[PDB]
Amino acid sequence: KDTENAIENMVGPDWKKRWLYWKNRTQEQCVHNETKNELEKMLKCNEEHPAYLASDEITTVRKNLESRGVEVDPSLIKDTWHQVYRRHFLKTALNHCNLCRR
Amino acid sequence: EVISLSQVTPKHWEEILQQSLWERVSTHVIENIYLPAAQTMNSGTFNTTVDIKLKQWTDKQLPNKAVEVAWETLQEEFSRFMTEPKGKEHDDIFDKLKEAVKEESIKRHKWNDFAEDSLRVIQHNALEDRSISDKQQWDAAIYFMEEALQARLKDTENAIENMVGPDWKKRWLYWKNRTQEQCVHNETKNELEKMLKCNEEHPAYLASDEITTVRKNLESRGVEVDPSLIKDTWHQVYRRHFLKTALNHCNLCRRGFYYYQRHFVDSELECNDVVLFWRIQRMLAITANTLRQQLTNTEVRRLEKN
Amino acid sequence: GFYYYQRHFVDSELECNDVVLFWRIQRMLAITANTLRQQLTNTEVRRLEKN
Amino acid sequence: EVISLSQVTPKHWEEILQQSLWERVSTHVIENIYLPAAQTMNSGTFNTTVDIKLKQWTDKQLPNKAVEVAWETLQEEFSRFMTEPKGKEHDDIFDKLKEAVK
């Protein structure tokens, strides 16, 4: 929950709140949301991807964001990856506990 | 027969020499002069870059290839006049002597050693004068330039189809499939096409960030590609992209200027490639005439004498 | 019309050359004026002040 | 860049060499051997004439055109490496020496 709240701060609210309380994302928030989406797509091909990212992946994500109109600092991608990967690992560990209790 | 060869009209010599010589050097200008010059949006640099190459190229290669074409062109017609059958009637009993005579006569057929010096001056002047004030000059130059570019486009496209293999239309129609390399090329092509889909102005040179990202957008789909495969794929697809753009540029160059109200619209349609093509077409046409004059004034007589 | 668009692949009735000439004249005059202004403000105006 | 050229894969070399030499010899073959030979209805004399002309062309012209192709292709690749890369990052300040050395 701590990671998810930091993530929401990083990327801002979803449409459920933007079109309900008339809020929007900051440019940093949209950039982080797109980087998170790219990293989620990456993790949906390798759910066991290690915590460490190669700079070639940072370059792969930067160019995809450019193809989506977004240019980012490598550390922006690194921090988004840190938070989202930790969230993913925690969800995986929680399902692992759900199997452990069985 | 050799006298009959001396009766060949200049019209045939000039057309044959011009057509043959240009075809020999049609790709050198495109690949080594035009296309790299097309990588900049500065038309002045584009014209400056090619003119320097052409003059250096002109001094070293053009008159040497031009004479060789003329030397061969005369022998090509000579052989046809000499030993070609009169349809189904032919005295083959004479062919041994005819070819034997030719070999001695061609060995003694030493083309004028100073023909190249005249051509260099001619070619420098033909290239130096870039003033095309006549619409007909423009019309002829663009259509022939299109044919050369269309030839390159099909040459690249045919190479690509082998590189990528048949599409689903032929795979299912003829019960064919792709090799694992073709499968890689199709996806490698698709990623490059998507990159160009947005970055239409992407320069021909690829950054290793692009080669690695193209390799990575493919690994994410289970496709691992060596960088060398991407670069080889890139070169063919880029030209197909570029060439279609050039032909569309040519289409608007003729059509856009053709519409009368558009001549006072100063759009970014500087068809400097038609200027380059036109001068070469004229330059070679003059070269052929100089060769033809030497061909009929000195060289054919030497052939007859030999 | 225009310098380039009047010529290439068009049946222009114009053949305009005066515009290029006087445009070049404008550019030469502007460059000369700027050079003169630089010379003035660098040397000549302070020379006059010293005098 | 010259070392990089020296490392170019044989596949590219052979493909470009074949394409260039074919460009050079296709019309020579078609016009001087194939079509003239086509006038006869006896495929055996057709083949005999074709082989004789091919042997003579090999003896006198073909290997010289082949060497020309190899040399000029090497020049073309060498210029591509030496000359301005087809990009935007190039610094022209080295062009004088690169072209003079080329």
- What DSSP letter does each residue of B127-160 carry, written as one string? HH------HHHHHHHHHHHHHHHHHHHHHHHHHH
**What are the structure tokens assigned to B130, written together?**
């870039």
Residues of D with CB under 8 A from a CB of B: 9, 11-12, 19-20, 23-24, 27, 31-32, 36, 39-40, 72, 76, 79-80, 83-88
Cβ-defined contact of B220 to A45 (cutoff 8 Å): yes
CA-CA distance, D39 to A42, in Å (whole number)?
A: 66
CA-CA distance, D65 to D61, in Å (whole number)?
A: 6
CB A78 within 8 A of CB A58: yes
CB A3 within 8 A of CB A36: no
Amino acid letter, residue B129: D
Cβ-defined contact of A63 to B213 (cutoff 8 Å): yes
CA-CA distance, B64 to C28, in Å (whole number)?
A: 44
Cα-based torsion angle of the residue sequence A6, A8, A10, A12 in order, rounded to the nearest 10 degrees: -150
Residue bearing tokens 């460009």: D23
- Going by the DSSP 8-state scheme, the letter that residue B207 receives in this structure is P
- Going by the DSSP 8-state scheme, the letter that residue D7 receives in this structure is T
CB A24 within 8 A of CB A12: yes
- Which of B79, B85, B204 has its CB closest to that of D39? B85
Chain A nearest-CA distance from B27, in A, is 34
**What are the structure tokens assigned to B128, written together?**
């130096």
CA-wise closest residue to C23 among C31, C14, C15: C31
Q: At what angle do helices B10-28 and B62-83 cross, to 10 degrees?
A: 130
Class of residue C36 by CB neighbours under 10 A (exposed 0-12, middle 13-18, buried 19+)? exposed
Q: Which residues of A touch B194 (CB under 8 A)?
A: 67
SS3 B242: helix
CA-CA distance, C2 to C15, in Å (whole number)?
A: 9
CB B38 within 8 A of CB B277: no
Cβ-defined contact of C12 to B263 (cutoff 8 Å): yes
Based on C-alpha coordinates, what's the Rg of chain D? 20
**Between chain A and chain D, are at least 3 CB pairs below 8 A?**
no
CA-CA distance, A36 to A68, in Å (whole number)?
A: 13
Chain A nearest-CA distance from B220, in A, is 7
**What are the structure tokens assigned to B277, written together?**
């093509």
Class of residue B108 by CB neighbours under 10 A (exposed 0-12, middle 13-18, buried 19+)? exposed
Testing the interface with B: which of D35, D88, D89, D96 to mutate, by most B Cβ within 10 A? D88
Q: Which helix (H) or strand (E) holds B224?
A: none
List the alpha helices (DSSP H) in chain A.
2-11, 15-18, 27-43, 55-67, 74-100
**What are the structure tokens assigned to B152, written together?**
């390159």
CB A36 within 8 A of CB A7: yes
Amino acid letter, residue D55: K
Tell me how the structure was determined: cryo-EM
CA D6 vs CA B225, D1, D75, D81: distances in Å:
22, 9, 12, 11
Cβ-defined contact of B23 to D19 (cutoff 8 Å): no
CA-CA distance, A1 to A87, in Å (whole number)?
A: 9
Q: Which residues contact D42 (CB under 8 A, 6 or more apart)?
A: none
- Which of B132, B264, B274 has its CB closest to that of C2? B264
Neighbours of B159 (CB within 10 A): 16
List the alpha helices (DSSP H) in B108-134.
115-128
CA-CA distance, A99 to A82, in Å (whole number)?
A: 25
CA angle B185/B191/B197 to nearest 5° reads 125
CA-CA distance, B197 to B206, in Å (whole number)?
A: 15
Q: What is the sign, positive or negative, of the torsion defined by CA atoms of D65, D70, D73, D78?
A: negative
Could you give phi then psi for residue D19, rounded to 5 degrees? -65, -45
Q: Which residues contact B229 (CB under 8 A, 6 or more apart)?
A: B181, B184, B185, B188
Q: Residue-wise over B192-212: b if at least 16 C-beta within 10 A, else e?
A: beebbeeeeebbbbbeeebbb
CA B196 vs CA B127, B148, B225, B237, B242: distances in Å:
34, 24, 19, 10, 10
Class of residue B83 by CB neighbours under 10 A (exposed 0-12, middle 13-18, buried 19+)? buried
CB A61 within 8 A of CB B217: no
C-beta contacts of B48-53 below 8 A and 24+ residues apart:
B50/B276, B51/B127
CA B16 vs CA B5, B11, B148, B154, B216: distances in Å:
14, 8, 17, 24, 52
CA closest to B217 among chain A residues:
A60
Neighbours of A99 (CB within 10 A): 7
Chain A nearest-CA distance from B77, in A, is 59
CA-wise closest residue to D31 among B173, C39, A99, B19: B19
CA-CA distance, B271 to B253, in Å (whole number)?
A: 6
Cβ-defined contact of B198 to A63 (cutoff 8 Å): no
Could you give phi then psi for residue B86, rounded to 5 degrees? -85, 70
CB pairs under 8 A between B and C: 51
CA-CA distance, B39 to B42, in Å (whole number)?
A: 9
Q: Residue-wise over A48-84: b if at least 16 C-beta within 10 A, else e?
A: eeeeebeeebbbbbbbbbeeeebebeeebbeebbebb
Q: Which helix (H) or strand (E) holds B163?
A: helix B135-164
CA-CA distance, A60 to B208, in Å (whole number)?
A: 11
- Going by the DSSP 8-state scheme, the letter that residue B86 receives in this structure is B
SS3 B89: strand
List the alpha helices (DSSP H) in chain B.
2-6, 10-28, 35-37, 43-60, 62-83, 95-107, 115-128, 135-164, 168-173, 180-198, 208-219, 227-258, 272-294, 300-305
Cβ-defined contact of B132 to C4 (cutoff 8 Å): no
* Residues making up chain D, counted from first to last: 102
CB B195 within 8 A of CB B211: no
**What are the structure tokens assigned to B206, written together?**
């690829």
CB B250 within 8 A of CB B149: yes
Class of residue B148 by CB neighbours under 10 A (exposed 0-12, middle 13-18, buried 19+)? middle
> Resolution, in Å, please?
5.5
CA-CA distance, A36 to A28, in Å (whole number)?
A: 12
Q: Which residues contact B88 (CB under 8 A, 6 or more apart)?
A: none
Q: At what angle do helices B62-83 and B272-294 cross, to 10 degrees?
A: 50
**What are the structure tokens assigned to A49, written together?**
């991807």
Widest CA span in chain A? 47
Cβ-defined contact of B36 to D86 (cutoff 8 Å): yes
Residues of A with CB under 8 A from a CB of B: 41-42, 45, 56-57, 59-60, 63-64, 67
Q: Which residues of B touch A56 (CB under 8 A)?
A: 212, 216
Q: Which residues of A touch B195 (CB under 8 A)?
A: 67
Widest CA span in chain D? 65
CA-CA distance, B130 to A26, in Å (whole number)?
A: 55
